[PDB]
Amino acid sequence: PIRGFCQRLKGKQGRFRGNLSGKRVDFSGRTVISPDPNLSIDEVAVPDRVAKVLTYPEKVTRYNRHKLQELIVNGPNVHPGANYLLKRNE
Amino acid sequence: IATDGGRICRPLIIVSDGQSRVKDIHLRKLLDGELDFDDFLKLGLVEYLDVNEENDSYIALYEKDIVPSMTHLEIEPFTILGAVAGLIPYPHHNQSPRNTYQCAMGKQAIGAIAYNQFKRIDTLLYLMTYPQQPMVKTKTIELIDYDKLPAGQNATVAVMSYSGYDIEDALVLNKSSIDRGFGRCETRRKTTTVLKRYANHTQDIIGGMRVDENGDPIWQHQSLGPDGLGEVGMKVQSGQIYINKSVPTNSADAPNPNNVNVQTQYREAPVIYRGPEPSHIDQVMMSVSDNDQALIKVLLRQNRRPELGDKFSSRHGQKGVCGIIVKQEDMPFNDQGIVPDIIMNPHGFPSRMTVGKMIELISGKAGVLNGTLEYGTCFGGSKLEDMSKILVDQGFNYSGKDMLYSGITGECLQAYIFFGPIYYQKLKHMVLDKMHARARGPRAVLTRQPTEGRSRDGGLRLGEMERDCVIAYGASQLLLERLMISSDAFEVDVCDKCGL
Amino acid sequence: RMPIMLRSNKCILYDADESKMAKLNECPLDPGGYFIVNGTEKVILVQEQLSKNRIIVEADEKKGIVQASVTSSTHERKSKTYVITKNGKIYLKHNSIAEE
Amino acid sequence: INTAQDKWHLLPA
Amino acid sequence: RAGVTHVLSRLSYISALGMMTRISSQFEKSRKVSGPRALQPSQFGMLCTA
Amino acid sequence: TLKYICAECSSKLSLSRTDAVRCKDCGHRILLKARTKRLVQFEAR
Amino acid sequence: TTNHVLEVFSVLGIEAARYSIIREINYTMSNHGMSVDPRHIQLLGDVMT
Amino acid sequence: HYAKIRPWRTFRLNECVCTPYNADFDGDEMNLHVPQTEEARAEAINLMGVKNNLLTPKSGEPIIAATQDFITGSYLISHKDSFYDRATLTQLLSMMSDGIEHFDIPPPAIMKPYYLWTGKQVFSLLIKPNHNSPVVINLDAKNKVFVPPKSKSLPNEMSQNDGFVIIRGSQILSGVMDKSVLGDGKKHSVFYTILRDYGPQEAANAMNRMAKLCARFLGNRGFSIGINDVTPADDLKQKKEELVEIAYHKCDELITLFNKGELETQPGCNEEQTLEAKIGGLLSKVREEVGDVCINELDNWNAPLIMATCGSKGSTLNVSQMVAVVGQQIISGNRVPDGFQDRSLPHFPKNSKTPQSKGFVRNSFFSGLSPPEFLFHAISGREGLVDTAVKTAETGYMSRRLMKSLEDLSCQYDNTVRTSANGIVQFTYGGDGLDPLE
Amino acid sequence: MIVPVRCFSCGKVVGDKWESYLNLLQEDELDEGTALSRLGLKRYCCRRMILTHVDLIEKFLRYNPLEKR
Amino acid sequence: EPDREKIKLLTQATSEDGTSASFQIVEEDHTLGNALRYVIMKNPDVEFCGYSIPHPSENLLNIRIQTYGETTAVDALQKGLKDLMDLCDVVESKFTEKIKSM
Amino acid sequence: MMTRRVVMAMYNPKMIDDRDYVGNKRLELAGQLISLLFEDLFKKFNNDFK
Amino acid sequence: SNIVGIEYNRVTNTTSTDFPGFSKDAENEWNVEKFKKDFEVNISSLDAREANFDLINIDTSIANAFRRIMISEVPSVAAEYVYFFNNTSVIQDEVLAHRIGLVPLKVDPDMLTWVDSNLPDDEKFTDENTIVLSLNVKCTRNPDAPKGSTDPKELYNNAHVYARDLKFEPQGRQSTTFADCPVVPADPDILLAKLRPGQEISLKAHCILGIGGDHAKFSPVSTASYRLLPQINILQPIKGESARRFQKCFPPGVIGIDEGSDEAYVKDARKDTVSREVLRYEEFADKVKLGRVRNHFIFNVESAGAMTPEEIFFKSVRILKNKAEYLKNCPITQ
Amino acid sequence: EIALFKYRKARLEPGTAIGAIGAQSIGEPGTQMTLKTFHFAGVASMNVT
RNA sequence: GCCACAGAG
Ligand SMILES: [Mg+2]
Ligand SMILES: [Zn+2]
Ligand SMILES: [Zn+2]
């Protein structure tokens, strides 16, 4: 049948249960699972080729200037590196 | 009396006066090559029965279980197993869920598909480089012609807890076994382009190879070739062109009686190899279709290697992923000098009733030592005592429990280890097609949220159950970040006197 | 033009030796029985159905309402007839008929 | 030479 | 009637042999345990029990 | 120049870009691109 | 006592209905060896009544 | 979790953490989100953290503990017949900590012939490596399979098979390590005591040390299951035959007397239910007794019995099914039904209610299954699969209903549970006002 | 499709013992256990290499596009 | 010119005087750690010798030496390496003189 | 006969016939389905030709 | 004290049993004179391919270390790179690359030098650290072949791409380096590939040297293992056909029967693969105690053909001593 | 001291979403539980769910 | 983007 208004507000893939009460998020990654006992019980192992796309937005402070400078110089192709930069004037 | 067509039947051997109607002489005629099953039908030795007819008859299983009150005899018991379940070695010793999982799993095995696979172009194909027939096979394998075109490899398996890396049905491969050619599988994919002729008598042109001012091929077209179709044999990486297509710039037809004879330029609409690891072109084929157009097919291939994540099965279920890849020096070894290839956890046997795998190991060891393929057909096959006698005759333990030496410290293992050849399959569910990462990417035009699927650079769902679980901790800021800040944030203007 | 399945009486592969199988690029260990339509090798699967031209008796425990259903199968049209019990009395039910 | 145990040879035919 | 034909998936020889000789269901969906999905002993040697 | 192979006849033939896709010996219409001549390397590891 | 819920409400009041619900859920859960803490059951009973 | 970067294309987590995830490395697929603002990061690490959440709020029991093959290593180390010399002791001690902590050696348990250390002092040094770590735990607990002592006059300490574990100070004095003491399921484990007395950091350290110990100790001491670990002795083969002969005689006599028509009638059941109850009870008793006989005769260092005693993965019933009679094939809480008219399979006498005709699998898995028994086992397994696949589709709806009802509740700052509209549901949560987590 | 140059687990050069195995099984009509014993194969790792190998390359070579049909 | 990064002495886990220490060795694995364990254990002055590999995906070796008495950790490691070198040389000499006969 | 077996099933519950019994299931093959489709297509073609 | 006992379900006394601190006597301190006096080497057999010898009075860690160095750290040569020139075959390019990689070369590795990988690819390969092989085969039909055509080799001239066709192409100073001893594949009749007429294989292979831990092709040992020497201790003599029963539970060159008293004895326990059968039967239990001797090692080293096995042993012990010296000389980082 | 400390740190911490904890502590056993009907009185004479 | 099946936990 035709996709009416009432059929876009009810159901599993509707809006109230498909895109409001739970919604797809950015900055995620899905992978198969392998054991690693030599890792502490609070530590998950992220592969090298997954951490190069997943990123954390760190704001420069007076305490982490040199570290972020080195991360920016290292670039988006070597693992301890940076992938995007955003400024206040921009 | 039923005369309908569409009923299911089975052939049995009529038995009367306490004697099977097929004597040894009729079996001799069959084994001589004459008196086909049709002839035994005509003489009245075998009869077709449906479940309606079996309701009043009396069927016997073995010859030893004859009573005068029977009417029929089952021709062989292992008819009860199907064709897909026929590969399972000694499945009457296993548990029923194991057989069910093997039936659902063996259809995803990687092996050679047919004798004509390298002239075949399918949408997806997996071929094992070094196939091997199963050492403990079944009469079903000889009948349905499975050993001739196998799928899987015979790995020497030690059943021991090598490290913590091999817990919860995981597996430990050998680095000097993968690199010698174990589980080396190659994958083939197809790319099809049809150069449609539009109503304006304008059609796609494959021509052109871009060259910069330096006079050399550009990096985007390093394997494009002279005509416009990527050359067979050349490597193709992420972000290159192997069919440099071009479509007419006048997308709308609008049939024109005007001249417009020349300067009907084309725009670039190529196919771009945006795969994540390198692939090689192995076939490029061109054809003329039924409507007399141009059809171009390209077969890409990549020779992946076993690593962490790939699945493995044992023909008794017991699926699992590789957990670690240890070097040959760290693996155990025996008096002869052999190291195992795959080590499995002994915690998969108590909870899964997988005694058939153990009997398979002993039968396979007896077979490789004796020199003959050993049957393991269901309800019968080859017994255990004779294989034990062969194992002691060649000079081994009766239960395959050979004494090993731990390569890490050179000491004798304080407990014996189950050691022998087991046949394993490499399944198609591999890590390299399931890795995923999102970051910031494409958005749907109706909801402005992340899209779905790894074929569109999508993200992961955070369903209602996960939302409730995050509520269950008291995490407010995290929920606000997950579902508003980084999912579908939007700046709106609201009039706080009316409210719209 | 019939799309015929492989290894049928009309296909080119009926009783073909291994050399002829080599000439036409076909595998001798090919199960056959699948239609090649539009480049895709489709399979028509055997379907299972309730028995036609016969009788079915069905009953349920808690409700206690027995029934006997018969699937009317003609070469032109198909229908179904129910013989059902209500409050311990037999009645006839049909799709075209309104009540019992 | 031939017994009643090896009666499965009908199945290949 | 819908879903008569399905694509013969080429993954292994046993896979093509197993998609062949398949029997669908007249019941598309079910909810009852021991309903149309139970393995009845009538099925000895007619359909596979594994 | 010869760059294309027909399926059955296996006759090395060329295809000018003003010519229909067809073999010059048999009436079949499959042309496979023959192996190129550029140096391709592989790691045996 | 009745292992029902609405009968106990109709005969003895809502406060007995709470106890009937709590005892029934404790019996059903501890018959299967799950061992849910009784305070969660108390919360459920006092939400429904 | 805290992230660590290792190059092998797969997510890897410690196996003690896989129990709450219900994760099985069988092609399992898990997800990894990354927060963006620092506030959500601090939220996740301080409230959602695995160290801060080692206790499920179901009952307060520990749920992040040792799993399979870690409990086996603990049992094999803490066995009574283990004695390590000094080099093996120091090798294990440096193995469980990677040479990062200072270890002080306790006096040996055997001094005159050779200096030997018991296997329990290894776990004693795991709990308290030196005098700087303040972990001093004191507890007692019962293992999974406990045997009472020879007489009532003794306490539980001197009990046979040493199932009563007592830790005073930091030494483990009596008791072998089992699932009941280092695993999820009981509120008097060792890691639970450490967590409830000294905090989460020492508990995480203890788990890390035990994991690294059991991860590189079983490679220096094997543990394998063969067919020698499943095959039965000479006595079981004839004992099982004698008891099944007696059972078949009994059931045949009762079935003949039922056919004649003078069977006892229950006050609330007809004759069919009487026959069903008698046969089912008799068969279940036969299975249980022959299973007891089979288990008692098995020698030690038979691996599956060690797996049952230790509680890693399995049960006594499973080894009983491997070595002795499989048992009654219960289908929907009843014997094998009548697919045909008055019989199961087209192989068996008409109107026969004999138990080998109604779903008894007499042969063990080691000896192979007969065709009727094979089809009956297939039926039971298929019904197990459908039950597992159907119960989920109702419990998910029930869970969503309960959550969408209860999710507005909270505990305000006056110990009164109030809804979203500040309507009081309880005046003190659970009467006492005590969190079931703690 | 073609016999490996080295055994999967041990490390022997097992490709040599393939054509000789076929020759000895074809001409002398021995039992193939004896054929594996005589060719310097004692560890059963190499025995399973050339006892369970299928010569699929000789079936694949029939269908090549290069030669005349 | 000396190769500095091959071996390190861990500072957060060492003792104040030198009774106990833990070195980290790069580009070595079990095949030398076990030999160092065996040789150092043949000291009457070593109470605790033990090697470990922290992660098989990273090439590293942490060896812990705790010695009671006058002996320090560094001297224990150096004399153990000397003893291992002498032992390998003795095996070399014996093997050569037995090969030379045949 | 229909109501006779209705009465028998009503007298004792043991006379229920299993719905999922294999003898009460019929197997439609590929040829029958192709025949059914060719019938409709041929009659549509004949009507259009008329 | 060092007899590792083999009980029917376990192995006992496996740990090393000598060091100061083990007993109050504080015996078995380190001393070079003790190992000089007690250690022994006995060569049972020495062939062109396989070596069998015995190391006596040495502990298990040292023999294990020798085995690990043999498997993973003794260098050898193999094909690391391939360049393909018009490889028209049904076997894929990378499969032929893999087989060419895992072929064993009969080159002494001392005549080369390690390749510095960080250098650019134009100059990383020189003539002093690279062996260049060339393979050039083209299959064509033979007109005077028999009509039967059952054997594929009669029809076609080069239907088998063997290993021996890998010609050596020297470059530069190698023209005098290997003039007396040319570089050839170690095993001549390896079946590298198969071809049909109309198909051509032409490849240039670059061979470097690396450790065994990088890849299995660099391993210079086909097999390099050891077993502890078994020992049969008969507590009480056996008589009659019971001695025949005792003989049946052993290999046919281990247990013998006397001709003066018809009582069983041991002949040679070196040939006894421990099948532990005699611990089964209760009639012979409590009379024989099978074991191994922990400080007596039977080494068996079979090489692929690259180098002579005692050269492998001496290179292994030399590598271990060099490693020990290298860790000795370098100073500890503060 | 230890008894009073363990009592005072066992109070329900104000702010906890106790309803969510209760809901996911009751629903999950429903996933876990296996059987349906148990014989309480007179074996099969009386049935209770 | 809409339907249909096939699968993975
Ligand atoms: Mg799973
Ligand atoms: Zn042509
Ligand atoms: Zn081998």
Q: Where are the domains of chain F?
A: 1-45
User: Which contacts qualify for H34-38: CB closer than 8 Å, 24 or more apart?
Assistant: H34/A27, H34/A28, H34/A54, H34/A55, H34/A56, H35/A27, H35/B478, H35/B481, H35/B482, H36/A27, H36/A56, H36/A57, H36/B481, H36/B485, H36/B486, H37/B477, H37/B481, H37/B485
Closest residue of H to J57, CA-based? H6
Give H96→chain J minimum CA distance, Å.
9
In chain E, the residue whose alpha carbon lies closest to the alpha carbon of K36 is E1
Per-residue 3-state assignment (H helix, E strand, C coil) for H403-436: HHHHCCCEECCCCCEECCCCCEEECCCCCCCECC
Question: Which residue out of B4, B50, B169, B457 is catalytically annotated?
Answer: B169
Give the closest residue to B401 by CA, choosing from H312, L279, F31. Answer: L279
Tokens of B119: 């002239």
Residue B334, amino acid? N
Residue type, H68: Q
Best mutation site among E8, E23, E25 for testing chain C: the one with the most C CBs within 10 Å?
Answer: E8
Q: How far is the CA of L96 from the centre of ligand 3 (A)?
A: 20
The runs of H, that is alpha helices, within chain F are none
Beta bridge pairs of residue F5: F12, F32
Is the CB of residue B306 less than 8 Å from the CB of residue B296?
no
| Rounded to 5°, angle at Cα H26 from H22 and H27 | 105
H127 CB-side CA count, 13 A: 26
**CA R_g for chain L:** 27
What dihedral angle (degrees, nearest 10) is formed by the CA atoms of B339, B343, B349, B351?
170
Sign of CA dihedral B443, B448, B454, B459: positive
Q: What is the DSSP letter of M14?
A: T
Q: Is M12 close to H429, i.e. CB distance below 8 A?
A: yes
Interface C:K, ≥3 CB–CB pairs < 8 Å: yes
Query: What residue has token string 């005046």?
Result: H427
Cα(J30)–Cα(L68) distance, rounded to whole angstroms?
Answer: 9
Please report which ligand is nearest the Cα atom of F22: 2
What's the gap in Å between the CA of E44 and the closest CA on chain H?
Answer: 7
Say whether residue I68 is in contact with chain C using an 8 A CB cutoff: no
Tokens 């060091």: give the residue. L19
Spatial separation of the C-alpha atoms in residues K5 and C85, rounded to whole Å: 12
Strands B246-248 and B266-268, sheet pairing: antiparallel
B234 and F38 within 8 Å at the Cβ level: the answer is: yes
The bridge status of strand H11-13 relative to strand A28-35 is parallel
* F23 labelled binding-site residue: yes
CB contact under 8 A, H8 and B307: yes
Q: Which residues, 6 or more positions from M1, have their beta carbon under 8 angstroms from its beta carbon?
A: none
In H141-224, where does DSSP find H-type helix?
A: 179-182, 190-197, 200-215
Q: Is C33 helix (H, G, I), strand (E, B) or coil?
A: coil
Indicate which technique resolved this structure. cryo-EM
* CA A41 and chain centroid, separation: 22
Best of L139, L219, L222, L301 to mutate (most I CBs within 10 Å, chain I): L222
Closest nucleotide relative to residue B101's CA, C1' based: N8
Q: Closest Cα partner for H87 from J34, B408, J75?
A: J34
Compute the CA torsion angle H109, H113, H119, H125 (nearest 10 deg): 50
Distance CA C81, CA C70 (A): 5
What one-character DSSP code corresponds to residue C63? T
Q: Are strands B320-326 and B72-73 parallel, antiparallel or unpaired?
A: unpaired
Is E38's CB within 8 Å of H383's CB? yes
- L218: three-class secondary structure by DSSP: helix
Residue H411: name the closest of B476, M7, B474 by CA.
B474
CA–CA gap between residue B8 and residue K25 (Å, rounded)? 9
Do the strands L221-234 and L160-162 form a parallel or antiparallel pair, or are they unpaired? Answer: unpaired
Q: Which nucleotide is nearest to H26 (CA to C1')?
A: N9
What is the C-alpha separation between B182 and B176, in angstroms, rounded? Answer: 9
E42 touches H: beta carbon within 8 Å: yes
Residues B324, J28: Cα–Cα separation, whole Å: 19
Q: Give the whole-angstrom CA distance, residue J24 versus residue J63.
A: 6
CA of H15 to the centre of ligand 1 (A): 15
Spatial CA neighbour of L84 closest among F3, B283, F45, F42: F42
d(CA B401, CA L6): 13
* Residue E24, amino acid: S
Give the other-Cβ count within 10 Å of H194's Cβ.
Answer: 24
Q: Report the C-alpha gap between B152 and B172 in whole angstroms.
A: 17
Tokens of I62: 């029939």
Cα B216 to middle of ligand 3, angstroms: 49
Residues in chain I: 69
Torsion of the alpha carbons at B74, B76, B77 and B82, rounded to the nearest 10: -120
Contacts of B383 (CB under 8 A, 6+ apart): none
Beta bridge partners, B286, equal B296, F31
Cβ neighbours around B66 below 10 Å, total: 16
Q: Does an H or E element contain J15, and which?
A: none
| Strand stretches in chain J, DSSP E | 7-9, 20-25, 48-52, 61-66
CA-closest candidate to residue E12, choices L9, B114, B154, H142: B114
Q: What is the dihedral of CA H309, H314, H320, H323, to 10 degrees?
A: -100
* SS3 category, H337: coil
Ramachandran sector of residue H332 (left: φ over 0; alpha: ψ -120 to 50; beta: rest): left
Report whether B395 contacts L275 (CB < 8 A): yes
Phi and psi torsions of H235, nearest 5°: -75, -35
Measured in Å, residue B169 CA sits from the centre of ligand 1 at 9
Q: Which residues, 6 or more positions from L229, have their beta carbon under 8 angstroms from its beta carbon? A: L54, L269, L270, L292, L293, L296, L297, L298
**Physical contact, B and H (3 or more Cβ pairs within 8 A):** yes
Hey, what CATH topology would domain L76-221 get? RNA Polymerase Alpha Subunit; Chain A, domain 2 (2.170.120)
**Gap between the Cα atoms of H12 and B308, Å rounded:** 10
Give the gap in angstroms from C-alpha A41 to the nearest C-alpha of chain B: 14
Separation CA H256–CA H262 (nearest Å): 10
Interface of C with I in 29-88 (CB under 8 A): none
| Contact by Cβ (8 Å): L288, L257 | no
* Pairwise CA distance, residues F7 & B283, whole Å: 12
Ordered DSSP codes for H267-327: TTS-HHHHHHHHHHHHHHHHHHHHHHHHHHHPPTT-HHHHHHHHTSS--HHHHHHHHS--E
3-class DSSP state of E7: strand
**Hey, CA dihedral for I15, I20, I21, I26, is it positive or negative?**
positive
Q: Which nucleotides of N are covered by protein (CB under 7 A)?
A: 1, 4-9
Closest chain B residue to A52, measured at CA: B437
Residue H107's domain spans which residues? 70-215
Give the Å distance between the CA of B101 and the centre of ligand 1. 11
**Which token pair is C92?**
């006839």
Q: How far is the CA of A1 from the C1' of N3 (A)?
A: 12
- The closest alpha carbon to F26, from I68, B291, C39, belongs to I68
Q: Which residues touch strand N (CB under 7 A)?
A: B 104-105, 107-108, 319, 429, 444, 446, 451-452; E 2-3, 6, 9, 28; H 24, 26-29
Residues in chain C: 100
Residue in L218, L121, L201 with CA at minimum distance from that of residue L167: L201
Which amino acid makes up residue H359? G
Q: Tell me how far CA of residue B409 lies from CA of A14, H83, H213, J31, L59, in angstroms.
A: 61, 18, 16, 9, 11
Whole-angstrom distance, CA of residue H402 vs CA of residue M28: 11
Say how far apart CA L193 and CA L95 lie, in whole Å: 9
**Alpha-carbon dihedral angle through residues K13, K14, K19, K25, given to the nearest 10 degrees:** -150
DSSP I53: B
Residue H187 CA, nucleotide N4 C1', distance (Å): 52
How many angstroms separate the CA atoms of H53 and H21, rounded?
Answer: 13
Report how many domains make up chain J. 1
Distances (CA, A) of H211 to B229, B377, H80, H206, L240: 56, 42, 21, 9, 56
By the 8 A CB rule, do B418 and B116 touch?
no
CA–CA separation, L163 vs L186, rounded Å? Answer: 9
Among candidates H129, H214, H17, H127, which has minimal Cα distance to A40?
Answer: H17
Kindly report the number of other CB atoms within 10 A of residue M41's CB atom.
Answer: 10
Separation of alpha carbons A28 and H335, rounded Å: 50
* J73 within 8 A of J81, measured Cβ to Cβ: no
Which of J95, J96, J97, J101 to mutate to test binding with chain L, by most L CBs within 10 Å of its CB?
J95
What value, to the nearest 5°, has the Cα angle with vertex H381 and ends H376 and H383?
A: 95
Contact H177, H77 (CB under 8 A): yes
Nearest to L132 by CA among L94, L80, L179: L80
User: What CATH number has the domain bearing residue H163?
Assistant: 1.10.274.100
Q: What's the CA gap between L164 and L186, in Å, rounded?
A: 9
- Written in H, E and C, the secondary structure of chain B is CCCCCCCCEEEEEEEECCEECCCHHHHHHHHCCCCCHHHHHHCCCEEEEEHHHHCCCCEECCHHHCCCCCCEECCCHHHHCCCCHHHCCCCCCCCHHHHHHHHHHHHHECCCCCCCHHHCCCCEEEEECCCECCCEECHHHHHCCCCCCCCCEEEEEEECCCCCCCCCCCEEEEHHHHCCCCCCEEEEEEEEEEECECCCCCECCCCCCCECCCCCECHHHCCCCCCCECCCCCEECCCEEEECCEEECCCCCCCCCCCCCCCCCEEECCEEECCCCCEEEEEEEEEECCCCCEEEEEEEEEEECCCCCCEEECCCCCCEEEEEEECHHHCCECCCCCCCCEEECHHHCCCCCCHHHHHHHHHHHHHHHHCCCEECCCCCCCCHHHHHHHHHHHCCCCCCEECCECCCCCCECCCCEEEEEEEEEEECCCHHHCCCCCCCCCECCCCCCECCCHHHCCCECCCHHHHHHHHCCCCCHHHHHHHHHCCCCCCCCCCCCCCC
Left if phi > 0, otherwise alpha if psi is -120 to 50, otherwise beta: which for L221?
beta
> Is residue M11 within 8 Å of H435, Cβ to Cβ?
yes
Q: Which of A68, E36, H220, B137 is nearest to L16 (CA)?
A: H220
Task: Write the residue in H332, H378, H387 that is nearest to E50 by C-beta.
Answer: H378
Q: Do C55 and K5 touch (CB under 8 A)?
A: yes
Query: What is the DSSP track for L105-174?
Result: B---GGGS----TTS-TTTS--TTS-EEEEEEEE--B-TT--S---SHHHHBSS-EEESTT-EE---TTH
Q: What is the DSSP letter of H153?
A: T
The number of helix segments (H) and strand segments (E) in chain H equals 13, 13
- Chain L touched by F45 (CB under 8 Å): yes
Residue carrying structure tokens 């008698």: H278
| DSSP E strand stretches across chain L | 3-7, 10-12, 40-46, 50-56, 76-84, 131-138, 160-162, 167-168, 191-194, 200-210, 221-234, 255-257, 264-266, 288-303
Strand partners, L83: F41, L204
> Half-sphere exposure of E33 toward its Cβ, with a 13 Å CA cutoff?
19
Which two tokens mark A20? 């409001």
Q: Taking each helix axis from N to C terminus, what angle separates H119-127 and H86-95, rounded to the nearest 10 degrees?
A: 30
Residues B379, B88: Cα–Cα separation, whole Å: 12
Which tokens in the block code for residue L207? 């061979």
Amino acid H336 reads: V
Cα C24 from Cα C32, distance rounded (Å): 15
Provide φ and ψ at B137, rounded to 5°.
-105, -175
Query: CB G43 to CB H425 under 8 A?
Result: yes
Ligand nearest to the CA of B168: 1
CA-wise closest residue to B312 among B81, B189, B155, B179: B155
Q: Is F3 known to sit in a ligand binding site?
A: no
Q: How far apart are CA B94 and CA H369, in angstroms?
A: 9
* CB pair distance less than 8 Å for H319 and B350: yes
3-class SS at L291? Answer: strand
Residue L57's CB is within 10 A of a number of other CB atoms, namely 13
H157/B276 Cα distance (integer angstroms) = 62
The strand ranges marked E within L15-126 are: 40-46, 50-56, 76-84
**Cβ atoms of B53 and B321 closer than 8 Å:** no
- The ligand placed nearest to the CA atom of residue H27 is 1
Pull the structure tokens for residue I59.
Answer: 């079936």
Using the structure, give the distance in angstroms from the CA atom of E5 to the C1' atom of N3, rounded to a whole number: 15
Is residue L132 within 8 A of residue L169, CB to CB? The reply is: yes
Residues C27/B115, Cβ–Cβ less than 8 Å = yes
Q: Which of L31, E31, G18 lies closest to H431, judged by CA?
A: G18
Beta strand J61-66 pairing with B235-236:
unpaired
How far apart CA B40 and CA B171 sit, in angstroms, is 51
CATH code, domain with J44: 3.30.1360.10
**Pairwise CA distance, residues H417 & H395, whole Å:** 26
Dihedral sign from CA coordinates of E3, E8, E10, E13: positive
Amino acid at B329: E
Q: Is B169 noted as a catalytic residue in this protein? A: yes
Residue contact L22–H114, C-beta within 8 A: yes
